[PDB]
Amino acid sequence: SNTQAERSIIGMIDMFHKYTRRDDKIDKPSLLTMMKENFPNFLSACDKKGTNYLAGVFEKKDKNEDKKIDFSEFLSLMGDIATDYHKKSHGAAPCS
Amino acid sequence: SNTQAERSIIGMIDMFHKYTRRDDKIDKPSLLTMMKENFPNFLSACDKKGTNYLAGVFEKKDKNEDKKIDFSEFLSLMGDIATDYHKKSHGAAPCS
Ligand SMILES: [Ca+2]
Ligand SMILES: [Ca+2]
Ligand SMILES: [Zn+2]
Ligand SMILES: [Zn+2]
């Protein structure tokens, strides 16, 4: 009944919720688990370059330094992953 | 081979490309077409409230006023749609 795009948005919201605690925010070890298990091919391309995408990702996205990733900060991170895929669809190197 | 999350990101990039011209950016009539055909249930919830989500959406997202939506601005808009779905998963009204 929803379109593919609406379904995609809904699946992203479900993935966020999967990694939250009671406060509806993602802590650091859960963000790193989420990234390793849901973005392994993205990360694999970084590792080959010698980029550890992960060290510091949580701190770069936790703009307000509350030690949690809330939904607004999660969307920023999803945007950064999407930007790397957009750049490579235009022949940039993986993990730029 | 890619995970569901990676597939989702890839489908979003494909949807962006579907509405671009030669310059890899989306013009105004194509953004409005993209929204009406890919987010109809989202928009239907706005129309019932008496919100015309669409008037002014292009101008709100075209931060640099070049009369095109580039990928960074498209991600902002996808974030705004996702934020409304996150808010309603927490019992906010549709189109808040
Ligand atoms: Ca935070
Ligand atoms: Ca623009
Ligand atoms: Zn939530
Ligand atoms: Zn493109």
Curated annotation (Swiss-Prot), chains A, B:
Membrane-spanning residues: none
UniProt feature coiled coil, ranges: none
InterPro entries: EF-hand-dom_pair, EF_Hand_1_Ca_BS, EF_hand_dom, S-100_dom, S100/CaBP7/8-like_CS, S100_Ca-bd_sub
Main location (coarse class): cytoplasm
GO CC aspect terms: azurophil granule lumen; collagen-containing extracellular matrix; cytoplasm; cytosol; endoplasmic reticulum; extracellular region; extracellular space; focal adhesion
Subcellular location: Cytoplasm; Secreted
Binding sites annotated in the UniProt record for Ca(2+): D62, N64, D66, K68, E73
GO molecular function, one term: calcium-dependent protein binding
Classification via SMART domains: S_100
Residues where N-acetylserine is found: S1
Residues given in the record as Zn(2+) binding sites: H17, D24, H86, H90
Domain EF-hand, residue spans: 12-47, 49-84
Reported tissue expression: Fetal ear, skin, and tongue and human cell lines. Highly up-regulated in psoriatic epidermis. Also highly expressed in the urine of bladder squamous cell carcinoma (SCC) bearing patients.
Keywords for this protein: Acetylation, Calcium, Cytoplasm, Disulfide bond, Metal-binding, Repeat, Secreted, Zinc
Subunit comment: Interacts with RANBP9.
Name of this protein: Protein S100-A7
Organism encoding this protein: Homo sapiens (Human)
